Every structure is written in structure tokens, then in C-alpha cells.
Amino acid sequence: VGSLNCIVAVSQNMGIGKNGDYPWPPLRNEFRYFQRMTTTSSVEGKQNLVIMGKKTWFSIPEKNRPLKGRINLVLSRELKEPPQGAHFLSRSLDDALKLTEQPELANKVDMVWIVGGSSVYKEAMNHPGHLKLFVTRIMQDFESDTFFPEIDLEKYKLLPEYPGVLSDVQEEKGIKYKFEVYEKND
């Protein structure tokens, strides 16, 4: 019960993963940016909630699990309890959001960040209400086996700027990328 946002890093051909990992070499400032966006809460004494499907939870290195300073929720219909290190397990995105409204969490969470994977995004994308997409455009093609859903530009507007988000083209390990913010309201 705060903002609902999706954050993703996409190659030119819309890939986000390849054999359980992201397709390019590690980009430390892309990770630094992902960490600060998802960890920074807007209010005082609140923490943001991160929602992720199971394959995404297992692609984070064990040392980095759970993602520090955030409430980590995993989506799965197969698991019986949250994986080791996870704070909550939900069977569906609606239940994950119905949970935020439990007195439990109702007072602790600021923003909800959808961090993947593809089915998770596809659904938050069609979910109604106000939604922002924070897209990292990796400007090169990468062999992938999982993709980000098509952004409908009649519903999503690309913003010209956003506070805290660099506007220039970045480059790291010879890969250029840029940060984009899209907003919907329906």
C-alpha cells in the first residue's frame, strides 16, 4: 500500500535470462541502481517489498539471499513453505498484494517492486491501476530463453525524466545501456 512498480533489465531483443542467469556479464552499476531503487523507501520506518517467481529467487547468488533491507516474497504454486532465506511465499500475485493489506505488513511496507520473471511481469502489466516500469535497456542482442512482455505504447508512456534516474547512455565492460521509466494509469 504504496506504489506498484516493475523493474527489469532487457537486451535489445527483449531477453532477460538464459539458463538461469541474465544473459550479459555482471554490470556492477546496473546492480547498484537495481539495489538502490528497490531498497529506498520514501516514508520513514518502512521497507519495500520485492516480489519474485521461484526461478528468479534461485538465480540470485546464495550469499545475496535474501536481498538485504527488503521484504522478500517468492511466488510459487508448488512450494509448501518459503525457500530458505525467503520471508513469505504466495501462490498468486493477487494474494501477494492482498497480504500487504494485512495489519502485519500494512504498516511496514512502502513500495512493492516486481523483480521478475516473465509471467510475473506479464500479469502486473495487465493488473489495473497505476504502475511504473523501470526498464534498463541493454543496447545489444543477447542469446536468451526468457523474455520481457511487449510494452503496449498506447497504455504506457515513456517519461522524459525521473528523479534519481540518470538520463545519459551508460557503458560498462563495453556494453552500453540506458535507464527508462514508463508510466501507466487505467
Ligand X SMILES: CN(Cc1cnc2nc(N)nc(N)c2n1)c1ccc(C(=O)N[C@@H](CCC(=O)O)C(=O)O)cc1
Binding residues: 9, 15-21, 30-35, 54-56, 64, 70, 76-78, 116-123
Instruction: Please give the helix or strand (H or E) that residue 48 lies within, else none.
Output: strand 47-53
Tell me how far, at minimum, the Cβ of 100 lies from ligand X, in Å. Answer: 19
List the interface residues with ligand X, window 26-55 (CB under 6 A): 30-32, 34-35
8 Å CB contact between 105 and 73:
no
CA distances from 161 to 103, 180, 181 (A): 35, 8, 8
Distance of alpha carbon 26 from its chain centroid, rounded? 17
27 CB-contact burial (10 Å; exposed 0-12 / middle 13-18 / buried 19+): buried
Q: Residue 31: name its binding partner from ligand NDP, ligand X, none (Cβ under 5 to 8 Å by kind).
A: ligand X
- The 10 Å Cβ neighbour count of residue 38 is 20
Tell me how far, at minimum, the Cβ of 45 lies from ligand NDP, in Å. Answer: 28
Site for ligand NDP, rule CB under 6 A: 8-9, 16-17, 20-22, 52-56, 59, 75-79, 91-93, 115-120, 123, 146
Distance, in Å, from the CA atom of 158 to the CA atom of 31, rounded to the nearest integer, reads 22
Instruction: Please give the helix or strand (H or E) that residue 96 lies within, else none.
Output: helix 93-100
Tell me how far, at minimum, the Cβ of 61 lies from ligand X, in Å. Answer: 6
x/- track of binding to ligand X for residues 149-168 (CB under 6 A): --------------------
Q: Residue 64: name its binding partner from ligand NDP, ligand X, none (Cβ under 5 to 8 Å by kind).
A: ligand X
Q: Is 24 in the site for ligand X (CB under 6 A)?
A: no
Half-sphere exposure of 60 (CA within 13 A, CB side): 23
Contact residues: ligand X, CB under 6 A: 7-9, 22, 30-32, 34-35, 56, 59-61, 64, 67-68, 115-116, 136
